Amino acid sequence: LAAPLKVGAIYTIGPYLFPHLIPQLHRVAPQMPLYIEENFTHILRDKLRTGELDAIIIALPFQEADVLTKPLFDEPFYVLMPADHPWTAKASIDSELLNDKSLLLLGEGHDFRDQVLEACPTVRKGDENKHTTVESSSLETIRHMVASGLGVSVLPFSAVDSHHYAPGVIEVRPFSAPVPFRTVAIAWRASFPRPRAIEVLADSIRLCSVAR
Amino acid sequence: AAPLKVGAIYTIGPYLFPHLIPQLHRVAPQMPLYIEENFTHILRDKLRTGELDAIIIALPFQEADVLTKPLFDEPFYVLMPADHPWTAKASIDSELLNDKSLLLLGEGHDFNKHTTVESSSLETIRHMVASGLGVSVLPFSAVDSHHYAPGVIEVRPFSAPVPFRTVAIAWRASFPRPRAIEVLADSIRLCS
């Protein structure tokens, strides 16, 4: 019939974007079906090179040969802590306090620093990988871990309120300004035979927030 | 004061864990849970090495020196486009589902040439069915895990016999915390 659009996304974006995005796309433009995939950045990129995926949705920085990049939107990071942990007193958190082993972060796509990548001068803080690298590919795992009170972590804005914990066992606090953020952008091959699909995708993504 | 590493397959986990774990934090705050979603063979392989302490799988399943307890039986339902001929029915006989119209995952879910969808997510297949590229079969836990407006995706039960999967729990018989495993499996039974 009509060609489908094979779209990929990282684990820190996919589960928290697709189940809301895809139906809207099906509504405004059912002309194209979407083939949903969730994976890591490198394998996603490799699937983009081999044409297995038409386009991917990843967080900047992202620079690959013969691949275009349209910065879709800016997503701010919030912090997640158990109900007991004293940092509930603060209504805003210093970015440095998250540099002890209390912080839990996935191996790929979860780190909220050094991908914010400022274009002004940055202070090279002598760097301590002083956090725990959880070898999981799901933010929900760390959500449960922190909810138990086994540590604290950082979540993108899309993810924070996507759980079934009764209010007051896991709690989210906003950063102290300036707030750290990732730039959710779309990547697709140069000379991709169907630019219109890329435009429809990008547009429908950018306006996913607008209620109906 | 000790972490219990639970696992589950991709067609069971996503529709169980988010409700299951807050329950096991509610009745068992003494124990932190480390969940993980993966394939059957790799879950078994991780249970053999102790990287996981328990796994929530689908029968039939059997592994050396590993106890199996059938937690519950979960029926299947036919996922179809809003504009299917099958919409004007009360049920669907099991034989009707053999075609390239039937979208099934591997590993995923089973009952012979169909259309195998090379994904680990039932959601991909769901969106495919919404788009209208044939029908599929979803467990009871998945049939409502979407945000599609009514009149886009229709679900229809089977006519007897109703096919189902026996969701069970598996853990090493050498495991020194059978009480914890019992509480876990019990809570899994509760959220069904």
mmCIF file of C-alpha atoms in Angstrom:
data_model
loop_
_atom_site.group_PDB
_atom_site.id
_atom_site.type_symbol
_atom_site.label_atom_id
_atom_site.label_comp_id
_atom_site.label_asym_id
_atom_site.label_seq_id
_atom_site.Cartn_x
_atom_site.Cartn_y
_atom_site.Cartn_z
ATOM 1 C CA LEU A 1 0.000 0.000 0.000
ATOM 2 C CA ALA A 2 1.449 3.323 1.155
ATOM 3 C CA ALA A 3 4.980 3.317 2.585
ATOM 4 C CA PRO A 4 5.389 3.352 6.393
ATOM 5 C CA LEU A 5 7.791 5.562 8.353
ATOM 6 C CA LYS A 6 10.240 3.550 10.456
ATOM 7 C CA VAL A 7 10.948 5.722 13.495
ATOM 8 C CA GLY A 8 13.401 4.944 16.284
ATOM 9 C CA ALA A 9 14.001 6.573 19.672
ATOM 10 C CA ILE A 10 16.270 6.208 22.700
ATOM 11 C CA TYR A 11 15.106 4.631 25.960
ATOM 12 C CA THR A 12 14.988 7.983 27.761
ATOM 13 C CA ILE A 13 12.612 9.328 25.099
ATOM 14 C CA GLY A 14 10.661 6.480 23.480
ATOM 15 C CA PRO A 15 8.365 5.056 26.208
ATOM 16 C CA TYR A 16 7.470 8.587 27.312
ATOM 17 C CA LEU A 17 6.827 10.057 23.860
ATOM 18 C CA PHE A 18 5.479 7.406 21.478
ATOM 19 C CA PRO A 19 2.254 6.226 23.188
ATOM 20 C CA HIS A 20 0.942 9.803 22.987
ATOM 21 C CA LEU A 21 2.577 10.886 19.731
ATOM 22 C CA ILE A 22 1.718 7.949 17.461
ATOM 23 C CA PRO A 23 -2.084 8.132 17.855
ATOM 24 C CA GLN A 24 -2.070 11.860 17.042
ATOM 25 C CA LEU A 25 0.011 11.149 13.948
ATOM 26 C CA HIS A 26 -2.483 8.429 12.997
ATOM 27 C CA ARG A 27 -5.227 11.042 13.365
ATOM 28 C CA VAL A 28 -3.827 14.031 11.482
ATOM 29 C CA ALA A 29 -2.031 11.898 8.884
ATOM 30 C CA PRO A 30 -3.064 8.217 8.602
ATOM 31 C CA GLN A 31 -1.509 8.252 5.114
ATOM 32 C CA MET A 32 1.632 6.764 6.633
ATOM 33 C CA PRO A 33 1.916 4.039 9.298
ATOM 34 C CA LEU A 34 4.746 4.331 11.803
ATOM 35 C CA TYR A 35 7.116 1.523 12.730
ATOM 36 C CA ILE A 36 8.037 2.203 16.348
ATOM 37 C CA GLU A 37 11.436 1.179 17.714
ATOM 38 C CA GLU A 38 13.236 1.799 21.012
ATOM 39 C CA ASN A 39 16.995 1.265 21.334
ATOM 40 C CA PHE A 40 20.352 2.791 22.278
ATOM 41 C CA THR A 41 21.877 5.687 20.333
ATOM 42 C CA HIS A 42 24.681 3.789 18.580
ATOM 43 C CA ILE A 43 22.496 0.887 17.427
ATOM 44 C CA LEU A 44 19.789 3.359 16.377
ATOM 45 C CA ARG A 45 22.342 5.261 14.310
ATOM 46 C CA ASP A 46 23.613 1.992 12.835
ATOM 47 C CA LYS A 47 20.046 1.126 11.840
ATOM 48 C CA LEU A 48 19.758 4.584 10.293
ATOM 49 C CA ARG A 49 22.888 3.971 8.217
ATOM 50 C CA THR A 50 21.640 0.612 6.943
ATOM 51 C CA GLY A 51 18.236 2.062 6.085
ATOM 52 C CA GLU A 52 16.526 -0.176 8.634
ATOM 53 C CA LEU A 53 15.092 3.021 10.107
ATOM 54 C CA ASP A 54 13.962 6.062 8.124
ATOM 55 C CA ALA A 55 14.503 8.435 11.046
ATOM 56 C CA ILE A 56 15.431 8.440 14.731
ATOM 57 C CA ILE A 57 14.592 10.675 17.696
ATOM 58 C CA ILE A 58 17.609 11.445 19.864
ATOM 59 C CA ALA A 59 19.009 13.993 22.307
ATOM 60 C CA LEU A 60 21.747 16.381 21.185
ATOM 61 C CA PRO A 61 24.647 16.301 20.591
ATOM 62 C CA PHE A 62 24.227 14.229 17.432
ATOM 63 C CA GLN A 63 26.517 14.531 14.417
ATOM 64 C CA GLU A 64 26.807 11.804 11.788
ATOM 65 C CA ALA A 65 27.796 11.758 8.119
ATOM 66 C CA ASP A 66 25.051 12.484 5.571
ATOM 67 C CA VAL A 67 22.407 12.848 8.286
ATOM 68 C CA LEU A 68 20.307 15.976 8.803
ATOM 69 C CA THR A 69 19.281 17.223 12.247
ATOM 70 C CA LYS A 70 16.244 19.301 13.210
ATOM 71 C CA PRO A 71 16.200 20.427 16.869
ATOM 72 C CA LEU A 72 12.579 19.754 17.822
ATOM 73 C CA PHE A 73 12.246 20.906 21.435
ATOM 74 C CA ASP A 74 14.043 21.656 24.704
ATOM 75 C CA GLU A 75 13.270 19.346 27.621
ATOM 76 C CA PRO A 76 14.270 20.431 31.162
ATOM 77 C CA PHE A 77 15.539 17.949 33.753
ATOM 78 C CA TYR A 78 14.000 17.508 37.200
ATOM 79 C CA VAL A 79 15.424 15.567 40.141
ATOM 80 C CA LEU A 80 13.917 12.516 41.855
ATOM 81 C CA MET A 81 14.374 11.631 45.519
ATOM 82 C CA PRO A 82 12.671 9.406 48.117
ATOM 83 C CA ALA A 83 10.165 10.949 50.537
ATOM 84 C CA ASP A 84 12.486 10.640 53.542
ATOM 85 C CA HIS A 85 15.646 12.178 52.070
ATOM 86 C CA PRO A 86 16.364 15.689 53.544
ATOM 87 C CA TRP A 87 16.675 17.379 50.119
ATOM 88 C CA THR A 88 12.887 17.779 50.238
ATOM 89 C CA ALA A 89 13.552 20.837 52.406
ATOM 90 C CA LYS A 90 15.144 22.627 49.459
ATOM 91 C CA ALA A 91 12.752 23.778 46.736
ATOM 92 C CA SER A 92 15.665 24.026 44.307
ATOM 93 C CA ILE A 93 18.879 22.016 43.971
ATOM 94 C CA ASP A 94 22.479 22.980 43.247
ATOM 95 C CA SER A 95 23.815 21.034 40.257
ATOM 96 C CA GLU A 96 26.967 20.033 42.146
ATOM 97 C CA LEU A 97 25.190 18.131 44.926
ATOM 98 C CA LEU A 98 24.513 15.329 42.418
ATOM 99 C CA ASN A 99 28.191 14.364 42.296
ATOM 100 C CA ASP A 100 28.232 11.801 45.091
ATOM 101 C CA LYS A 101 27.569 8.076 44.727
ATOM 102 C CA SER A 102 23.942 8.763 45.682
ATOM 103 C CA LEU A 103 23.211 9.489 42.018
ATOM 104 C CA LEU A 104 21.996 6.604 39.852
ATOM 105 C CA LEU A 105 22.410 6.908 36.078
ATOM 106 C CA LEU A 106 21.962 4.537 33.132
ATOM 107 C CA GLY A 107 24.922 3.620 30.941
ATOM 108 C CA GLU A 108 23.500 5.334 27.870
ATOM 109 C CA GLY A 109 21.336 8.379 27.236
ATOM 110 C CA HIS A 110 20.607 9.287 30.845
ATOM 111 C CA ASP A 111 23.439 11.611 31.798
ATOM 112 C CA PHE A 112 22.225 15.186 32.226
ATOM 113 C CA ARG A 113 25.665 16.800 32.044
ATOM 114 C CA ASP A 114 28.281 17.063 29.258
ATOM 115 C CA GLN A 115 25.491 16.724 26.712
ATOM 116 C CA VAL A 116 24.005 20.073 27.696
ATOM 117 C CA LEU A 117 27.138 21.269 25.931
ATOM 118 C CA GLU A 118 27.206 25.056 26.326
ATOM 119 C CA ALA A 119 28.424 27.204 23.425
ATOM 120 C CA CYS A 120 29.877 29.753 25.837
ATOM 121 C CA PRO A 121 33.032 28.967 27.804
ATOM 122 C CA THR A 122 32.543 26.033 30.160
ATOM 123 C CA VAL A 123 34.610 25.431 33.273
ATOM 124 C CA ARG A 124 36.320 22.073 32.950
ATOM 125 C CA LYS A 125 35.481 20.800 36.403
ATOM 126 C CA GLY A 126 38.093 18.158 37.170
ATOM 127 C CA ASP A 127 35.777 15.249 36.774
ATOM 128 C CA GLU A 128 34.707 12.541 39.114
ATOM 129 C CA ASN A 129 32.601 9.762 37.664
ATOM 130 C CA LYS A 130 31.209 9.799 41.195
ATOM 131 C CA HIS A 131 27.814 8.259 40.626
ATOM 132 C CA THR A 132 26.490 4.729 40.181
ATOM 133 C CA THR A 133 26.134 3.472 36.614
ATOM 134 C CA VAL A 134 23.054 1.247 36.687
ATOM 135 C CA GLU A 135 23.306 -1.322 33.896
ATOM 136 C CA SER A 136 19.641 -1.085 32.911
ATOM 137 C CA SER A 137 17.844 0.282 29.852
ATOM 138 C CA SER A 138 14.769 1.651 31.615
ATOM 139 C CA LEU A 139 14.167 4.753 33.735
ATOM 140 C CA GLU A 140 11.386 2.886 35.544
ATOM 141 C CA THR A 141 13.948 0.587 37.161
ATOM 142 C CA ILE A 142 15.766 3.531 38.719
ATOM 143 C CA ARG A 143 12.398 5.111 39.540
ATOM 144 C CA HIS A 144 11.529 2.056 41.630
ATOM 145 C CA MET A 145 15.036 1.946 43.118
ATOM 146 C CA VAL A 146 14.827 5.569 44.270
ATOM 147 C CA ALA A 147 11.231 5.116 45.429
ATOM 148 C CA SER A 148 12.561 2.377 47.704
ATOM 149 C CA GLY A 149 15.100 4.893 48.997
ATOM 150 C CA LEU A 150 18.225 3.287 47.564
ATOM 151 C CA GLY A 151 19.431 6.548 46.028
ATOM 152 C CA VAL A 152 18.468 9.623 44.013
ATOM 153 C CA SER A 153 18.429 10.274 40.266
ATOM 154 C CA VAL A 154 17.581 12.677 37.440
ATOM 155 C CA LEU A 155 14.634 12.452 35.043
ATOM 156 C CA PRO A 156 13.553 14.297 31.891
ATOM 157 C CA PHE A 157 10.307 16.275 32.245
ATOM 158 C CA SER A 158 8.309 13.805 30.142
ATOM 159 C CA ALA A 159 9.122 10.920 32.478
ATOM 160 C CA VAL A 160 8.643 12.263 36.023
ATOM 161 C CA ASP A 161 4.859 11.841 36.324
ATOM 162 C CA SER A 162 4.532 8.502 34.535
ATOM 163 C CA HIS A 163 4.088 6.083 37.435
ATOM 164 C CA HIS A 164 1.566 4.553 39.833
ATOM 165 C CA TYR A 165 3.224 5.401 43.145
ATOM 166 C CA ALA A 166 0.781 6.885 45.652
ATOM 167 C CA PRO A 167 1.642 10.595 46.156
ATOM 168 C CA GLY A 168 4.272 10.972 48.872
ATOM 169 C CA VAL A 169 6.597 7.980 48.561
ATOM 170 C CA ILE A 170 8.602 9.260 45.604
ATOM 171 C CA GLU A 171 9.034 12.995 45.109
ATOM 172 C CA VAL A 172 10.348 15.289 42.392
ATOM 173 C CA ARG A 173 12.130 18.609 42.908
ATOM 174 C CA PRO A 174 13.034 21.285 40.316
ATOM 175 C CA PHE A 175 16.628 22.408 39.697
ATOM 176 C CA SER A 176 17.990 25.792 40.730
ATOM 177 C CA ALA A 177 18.139 28.183 37.770
ATOM 178 C CA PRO A 178 19.781 27.824 35.346
ATOM 179 C CA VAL A 179 17.885 24.582 34.702
ATOM 180 C CA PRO A 180 19.734 21.825 32.789
ATOM 181 C CA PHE A 181 18.042 20.511 29.646
ATOM 182 C CA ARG A 182 18.429 18.153 26.702
ATOM 183 C CA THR A 183 17.604 19.128 23.127
ATOM 184 C CA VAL A 184 15.268 16.508 21.677
ATOM 185 C CA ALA A 185 15.987 16.459 17.947
ATOM 186 C CA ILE A 186 15.168 14.292 14.929
ATOM 187 C CA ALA A 187 17.804 12.707 12.684
ATOM 188 C CA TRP A 188 17.387 11.314 9.171
ATOM 189 C CA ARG A 189 19.584 10.409 6.199
ATOM 190 C CA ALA A 190 20.587 13.083 3.721
ATOM 191 C CA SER A 191 18.907 12.400 0.369
ATOM 192 C CA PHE A 192 16.041 10.648 2.158
ATOM 193 C CA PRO A 193 13.454 10.018 -0.620
ATOM 194 C CA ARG A 194 10.540 11.364 1.457
ATOM 195 C CA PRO A 195 11.165 14.791 3.072
ATOM 196 C CA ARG A 196 7.412 15.342 3.453
ATOM 197 C CA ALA A 197 7.199 12.505 5.979
ATOM 198 C CA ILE A 198 10.048 14.073 7.946
ATOM 199 C CA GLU A 199 8.200 17.396 7.987
ATOM 200 C CA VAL A 200 4.894 15.812 9.043
ATOM 201 C CA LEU A 201 6.664 13.832 11.759
ATOM 202 C CA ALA A 202 8.585 16.839 13.088
ATOM 203 C CA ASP A 203 5.505 19.076 13.048
ATOM 204 C CA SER A 204 3.239 16.537 14.753
ATOM 205 C CA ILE A 205 5.935 15.967 17.383
ATOM 206 C CA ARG A 206 6.451 19.677 18.064
ATOM 207 C CA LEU A 207 2.719 20.132 18.688
ATOM 208 C CA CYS A 208 2.177 16.962 20.730
ATOM 209 C CA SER A 209 1.874 19.135 23.839
ATOM 210 C CA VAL A 210 -1.105 21.140 22.561
ATOM 211 C CA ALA A 211 -4.297 19.659 24.018
ATOM 212 C CA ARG A 212 -7.444 19.016 21.983
ATOM 213 C CA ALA B 1 17.858 -4.509 53.707
ATOM 214 C CA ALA B 2 18.514 -6.648 50.626
ATOM 215 C CA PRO B 3 17.666 -6.137 46.929
ATOM 216 C CA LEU B 4 15.446 -8.623 45.084
ATOM 217 C CA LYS B 5 16.169 -8.718 41.353
ATOM 218 C CA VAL B 6 12.935 -9.540 39.528
ATOM 219 C CA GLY B 7 12.682 -10.022 35.766
ATOM 220 C CA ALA B 8 9.931 -10.427 33.170
ATOM 221 C CA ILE B 9 9.472 -10.870 29.428
ATOM 222 C CA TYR B 10 8.582 -7.983 27.121
ATOM 223 C CA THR B 11 4.993 -9.189 26.691
ATOM 224 C CA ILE B 12 4.435 -9.427 30.451
ATOM 225 C CA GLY B 13 6.662 -6.835 32.124
ATOM 226 C CA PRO B 14 5.468 -3.461 30.709
ATOM 227 C CA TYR B 15 1.855 -4.243 31.657
ATOM 228 C CA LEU B 16 2.618 -5.610 35.121
ATOM 229 C CA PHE B 17 5.672 -3.922 36.673
ATOM 230 C CA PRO B 18 4.362 -0.321 36.919
ATOM 231 C CA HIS B 19 1.417 -1.524 39.018
ATOM 232 C CA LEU B 20 3.303 -4.376 40.684
ATOM 233 C CA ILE B 21 6.272 -2.542 42.201
ATOM 234 C CA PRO B 22 4.435 0.255 44.054
ATOM 235 C CA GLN B 23 2.361 -2.556 45.578
ATOM 236 C CA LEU B 24 5.540 -4.290 46.748
ATOM 237 C CA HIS B 25 6.772 -0.984 48.143
ATOM 238 C CA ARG B 26 3.436 -0.542 49.896
ATOM 239 C CA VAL B 27 3.314 -3.946 51.592
ATOM 240 C CA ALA B 28 7.057 -4.617 51.537
ATOM 241 C CA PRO B 29 9.082 -1.425 52.098
ATOM 242 C CA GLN B 30 11.729 -3.584 53.782
ATOM 243 C CA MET B 31 12.795 -4.857 50.363
ATOM 244 C CA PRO B 32 13.977 -2.842 47.323
ATOM 245 C CA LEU B 33 13.152 -4.276 43.894
ATOM 246 C CA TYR B 34 15.419 -4.134 40.846
ATOM 247 C CA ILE B 35 13.328 -4.948 37.773
ATOM 248 C CA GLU B 36 14.467 -5.878 34.269
ATOM 249 C CA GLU B 37 12.658 -6.628 31.008
ATOM 250 C CA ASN B 38 14.189 -9.119 28.567
ATOM 251 C CA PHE B 39 13.707 -12.259 26.451
ATOM 252 C CA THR B 40 12.936 -15.714 27.871
ATOM 253 C CA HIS B 41 16.309 -17.314 27.121
ATOM 254 C CA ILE B 42 18.355 -14.429 28.523
ATOM 255 C CA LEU B 43 16.168 -14.227 31.640
ATOM 256 C CA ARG B 44 16.746 -17.939 32.185
ATOM 257 C CA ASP B 45 20.458 -17.464 31.498
ATOM 258 C CA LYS B 46 20.574 -14.626 34.041
ATOM 259 C CA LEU B 47 18.671 -16.706 36.596
ATOM 260 C CA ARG B 48 21.243 -19.471 36.183
ATOM 261 C CA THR B 49 24.058 -17.041 37.039
ATOM 262 C CA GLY B 50 22.257 -15.361 39.929
ATOM 263 C CA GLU B 51 22.143 -11.964 38.235
ATOM 264 C CA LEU B 52 18.398 -12.366 38.690
ATOM 265 C CA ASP B 53 16.667 -13.934 41.690
ATOM 266 C CA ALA B 54 13.264 -14.460 40.071
ATOM 267 C CA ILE B 55 11.645 -14.242 36.638
ATOM 268 C CA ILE B 56 8.029 -13.826 35.544
ATOM 269 C CA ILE B 57 7.572 -15.942 32.423
ATOM 270 C CA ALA B 58 4.931 -17.765 30.386
ATOM 271 C CA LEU B 59 4.286 -21.509 30.481
ATOM 272 C CA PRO B 60 5.444 -23.917 29.251
ATOM 273 C CA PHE B 61 8.784 -23.382 30.995
ATOM 274 C CA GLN B 62 11.297 -25.706 32.650
ATOM 275 C CA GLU B 63 14.900 -25.365 33.821
ATOM 276 C CA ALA B 64 17.210 -27.553 35.917
ATOM 277 C CA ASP B 65 17.151 -26.892 39.677
ATOM 278 C CA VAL B 66 14.594 -24.107 39.230
ATOM 279 C CA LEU B 67 11.146 -24.144 40.834
ATOM 280 C CA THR B 68 8.117 -23.065 38.804
ATOM 281 C CA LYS B 69 4.834 -21.821 40.260
ATOM 282 C CA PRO B 70 1.962 -21.039 37.859
ATOM 283 C CA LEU B 71 0.702 -17.716 39.189
ATOM 284 C CA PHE B 72 -2.317 -17.204 36.932
ATOM 285 C CA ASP B 73 -3.988 -17.750 33.560
ATOM 286 C CA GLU B 74 -4.267 -14.749 31.237
ATOM 287 C CA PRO B 75 -6.641 -14.966 28.227
ATOM 288 C CA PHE B 76 -5.930 -13.617 24.740
ATOM 289 C CA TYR B 77 -7.925 -11.136 22.659
ATOM 290 C CA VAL B 78 -8.039 -10.271 18.963
ATOM 291 C CA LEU B 79 -6.737 -6.809 18.092
ATOM 292 C CA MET B 80 -8.236 -5.444 14.872
ATOM 293 C CA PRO B 81 -8.572 -2.197 12.876
ATOM 294 C CA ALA B 82 -11.733 -0.144 13.412
ATOM 295 C CA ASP B 83 -12.852 -0.997 9.870
ATOM 296 C CA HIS B 84 -12.497 -4.778 9.818
ATOM 297 C CA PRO B 85 -15.122 -7.240 8.567
ATOM 298 C CA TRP B 86 -14.630 -8.997 11.943
ATOM 299 C CA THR B 87 -16.043 -5.964 13.773
ATOM 300 C CA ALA B 88 -19.596 -7.235 13.267
ATOM 301 C CA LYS B 89 -19.019 -10.290 15.464
ATOM 302 C CA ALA B 90 -19.284 -11.308 19.113
ATOM 303 C CA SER B 91 -16.327 -13.678 18.897
ATOM 304 C CA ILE B 92 -13.656 -15.093 16.593
ATOM 305 C CA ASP B 93 -12.926 -18.779 16.124
ATOM 306 C CA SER B 94 -9.220 -19.561 16.521
ATOM 307 C CA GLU B 95 -8.788 -20.987 13.000
ATOM 308 C CA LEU B 96 -9.723 -17.682 11.353
ATOM 309 C CA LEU B 97 -6.383 -16.277 12.497
ATOM 310 C CA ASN B 98 -3.935 -17.624 9.949
ATOM 311 C CA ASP B 99 -2.695 -15.227 7.288
ATOM 312 C CA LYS B 100 -0.120 -12.573 6.511
ATOM 313 C CA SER B 101 -2.747 -10.413 8.200
ATOM 314 C CA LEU B 102 -1.712 -11.777 11.592
ATOM 315 C CA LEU B 103 1.095 -9.685 13.075
ATOM 316 C CA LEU B 104 3.042 -11.653 15.684
ATOM 317 C CA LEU B 105 6.264 -10.905 17.572
ATOM 318 C CA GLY B 106 9.300 -13.143 17.978
ATOM 319 C CA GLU B 107 9.827 -14.040 20.727
ATOM 320 C CA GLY B 108 6.617 -12.261 21.729
ATOM 321 C CA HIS B 109 3.352 -14.194 21.654
ATOM 322 C CA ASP B 110 2.100 -17.300 19.840
ATOM 323 C CA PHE B 111 -0.845 -19.694 19.524
ATOM 324 C CA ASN B 112 1.915 -21.781 9.822
ATOM 325 C CA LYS B 113 3.287 -18.757 7.988
ATOM 326 C CA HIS B 114 2.404 -15.278 9.328
ATOM 327 C CA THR B 115 3.916 -11.855 9.398
ATOM 328 C CA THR B 116 6.598 -11.735 12.080
ATOM 329 C CA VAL B 117 7.189 -8.260 13.491
ATOM 330 C CA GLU B 118 10.859 -7.954 14.431
ATOM 331 C CA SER B 119 10.212 -5.850 17.531
ATOM 332 C CA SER B 120 10.257 -6.526 21.263
ATOM 333 C CA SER B 121 7.231 -4.318 21.856
ATOM 334 C CA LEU B 122 3.549 -5.197 21.542
ATOM 335 C CA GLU B 123 2.993 -1.458 21.146
ATOM 336 C CA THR B 124 4.621 -1.408 17.703
ATOM 337 C CA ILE B 125 2.223 -4.117 16.565
ATOM 338 C CA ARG B 126 -0.666 -2.217 18.169
ATOM 339 C CA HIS B 127 0.151 0.907 16.165
ATOM 340 C CA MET B 128 0.458 -1.272 13.061
ATOM 341 C CA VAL B 129 -3.054 -2.618 13.657
ATOM 342 C CA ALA B 130 -4.313 0.918 14.277
ATOM 343 C CA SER B 131 -2.820 1.938 10.939
ATOM 344 C CA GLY B 132 -4.622 -1.029 9.399
ATOM 345 C CA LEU B 133 -1.845 -3.415 8.372
ATOM 346 C CA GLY B 134 -3.723 -6.488 9.568
ATOM 347 C CA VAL B 135 -4.727 -7.937 12.923
ATOM 348 C CA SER B 136 -2.965 -9.302 15.976
ATOM 349 C CA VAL B 137 -3.389 -10.979 19.352
ATOM 350 C CA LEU B 138 -2.880 -9.215 22.679
ATOM 351 C CA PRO B 139 -2.973 -10.494 26.279
ATOM 352 C CA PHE B 140 -5.609 -9.081 28.649
ATOM 353 C CA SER B 141 -3.051 -6.775 30.268
ATOM 354 C CA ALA B 142 -2.207 -4.969 27.029
ATOM 355 C CA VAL B 143 -5.630 -4.418 25.434
ATOM 356 C CA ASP B 144 -6.124 -1.048 27.162
ATOM 357 C CA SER B 145 -2.532 0.187 27.450
ATOM 358 C CA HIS B 146 -2.986 2.847 24.765
ATOM 359 C CA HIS B 147 -4.266 6.380 24.211
ATOM 360 C CA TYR B 148 -6.098 5.824 20.928
ATOM 361 C CA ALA B 149 -9.566 7.362 20.819
ATOM 362 C CA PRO B 150 -12.502 4.917 20.547
ATOM 363 C CA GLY B 151 -13.294 3.895 16.972
ATOM 364 C CA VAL B 152 -9.681 3.334 15.955
ATOM 365 C CA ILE B 153 -8.770 -0.016 17.499
ATOM 366 C CA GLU B 154 -11.301 -2.746 18.272
ATOM 367 C CA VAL B 155 -10.788 -5.807 20.465
ATOM 368 C CA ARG B 156 -12.834 -8.993 20.134
ATOM 369 C CA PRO B 157 -12.755 -12.150 22.303
ATOM 370 C CA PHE B 158 -12.269 -15.653 20.912
ATOM 371 C CA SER B 159 -15.033 -18.221 20.675
ATOM 372 C CA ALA B 160 -14.427 -21.266 22.891
ATOM 373 C CA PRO B 161 -11.855 -22.550 23.408
ATOM 374 C CA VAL B 162 -10.383 -19.295 24.704
ATOM 375 C CA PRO B 163 -6.597 -19.392 24.275
ATOM 376 C CA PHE B 164 -4.498 -18.183 27.200
ATOM 377 C CA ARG B 165 -1.014 -18.094 28.688
ATOM 378 C CA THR B 166 -0.168 -19.421 32.140
ATOM 379 C CA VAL B 167 1.968 -16.695 33.697
ATOM 380 C CA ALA B 168 4.322 -18.271 36.225
ATOM 381 C CA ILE B 169 7.267 -17.343 38.445
ATOM 382 C CA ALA B 170 10.671 -19.053 38.424
ATOM 383 C CA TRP B 171 13.470 -18.977 40.995
ATOM 384 C CA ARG B 172 16.437 -21.089 42.099
ATOM 385 C CA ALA B 173 15.599 -23.799 44.633
ATOM 386 C CA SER B 174 18.839 -22.847 46.387
ATOM 387 C CA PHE B 175 17.523 -19.333 47.053
ATOM 388 C CA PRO B 176 17.808 -18.537 50.796
ATOM 389 C CA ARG B 177 14.799 -16.193 50.809
ATOM 390 C CA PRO B 178 11.689 -18.246 49.932
ATOM 391 C CA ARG B 179 9.514 -15.899 51.994
ATOM 392 C CA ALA B 180 10.490 -12.945 49.807
ATOM 393 C CA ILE B 181 9.792 -14.965 46.664
ATOM 394 C CA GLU B 182 6.421 -15.962 48.110
ATOM 395 C CA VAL B 183 5.494 -12.341 48.835
ATOM 396 C CA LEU B 184 6.604 -11.373 45.323
ATOM 397 C CA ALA B 185 4.641 -14.104 43.527
ATOM 398 C CA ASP B 186 1.648 -13.417 45.764
ATOM 399 C CA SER B 187 1.698 -9.724 44.854
ATOM 400 C CA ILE B 188 1.972 -10.694 41.185
ATOM 401 C CA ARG B 189 -1.186 -12.763 41.635
ATOM 402 C CA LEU B 190 -2.858 -9.770 43.294
ATOM 403 C CA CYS B 191 -2.251 -7.440 40.341
ATOM 404 C CA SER B 192 -4.196 -9.562 37.850
#
